[PDB]
Structure 1
């Protein structure tokens, strides 16, 4: 049951995103622009296929996947990763693997807001999105 995640979401708070980007090896100029962007995330379904768009003034991304089925992904910072997205405890958990590394992108609904927790290494970033009508 992915349905309450679906829709258009706007970033309204971000904590420790620079730490997360730095842990991934993102260069300073890119972190600097990304620290001031507020993306829009769009999550849509068609049958078993989810599509997750991230739009901004800086980078855009789009992925499509089936829950529980691995897919190739090229991230906004140009990592080529092996990904899987699954529901776990009602949370949408996206795991990326590359070069023996991993990062998790966990989305949880709290009081109607979409909380995205990004973990790589020891860095833990929390970014809050609010629904657009």
Structure 2
């Protein structure tokens, strides 16, 4: 069960993720700072999820069911069509395809550990960012 309100405890390689997607330095710096203490709300009902991630300047709300395509944005803010699957019991993986144009291959994963941590990974081609959260 991923449901709850989550707070960040670790972040690794976020600014570089943005950098390889081409994000300019002014915007990268604003984004990393804005996301340093995010609010993440998840409501899980079986395979149905609601995930709201808020930084100081942005809020994103996704609604999806595992196995059903949905629209979101890439981490750099480009609209995409996404599809989540269960890789294993505690771990979901998301493939993203841009709605318009082409770009680096992006994806994300979310997994719950036995100690109750939520691990988010985000990838752009060969660059990986890892963020870890715990429940409030």
TM band (smaller chain): 0.7 to 0.9
Instruction: Label 1:12 to 1:34 Cα distance change in 2 as closer, same or farther (>3 A).
Output: farther
Alignment of 1:1-133 (within 5 A): 3=1, 5-36=2-33, 37-46=36-45, 49-75=48-74, 77-89=76-88, 90-98=90-98, 99=102, 101-110=104-113, 111-132=115-136
TM-score norm. by structure 2 comes to: 0.84
- Aligned-residue RMSD, C-alpha: 1.8
TM-score norm. by structure 1 comes to: 0.85
- Is the Cα contact below 8 Å between 2:74 and 2:96 reproduced in 1? no
For 2:51 and 2:27, how far apart are their aligned partners in 1?
A: 22
- Where in structure 1 are there 5+ consecutive unaligned residues? none
Runs of 4+ deviating beyond 4 Å: none
Helix, strand or coil: the match of 2:105?
A: strand
Count of residue pairs brought into register by the alignment: 129
- Is the Cα contact below 8 Å between 2:74 and 2:106 reproduced in 1? no
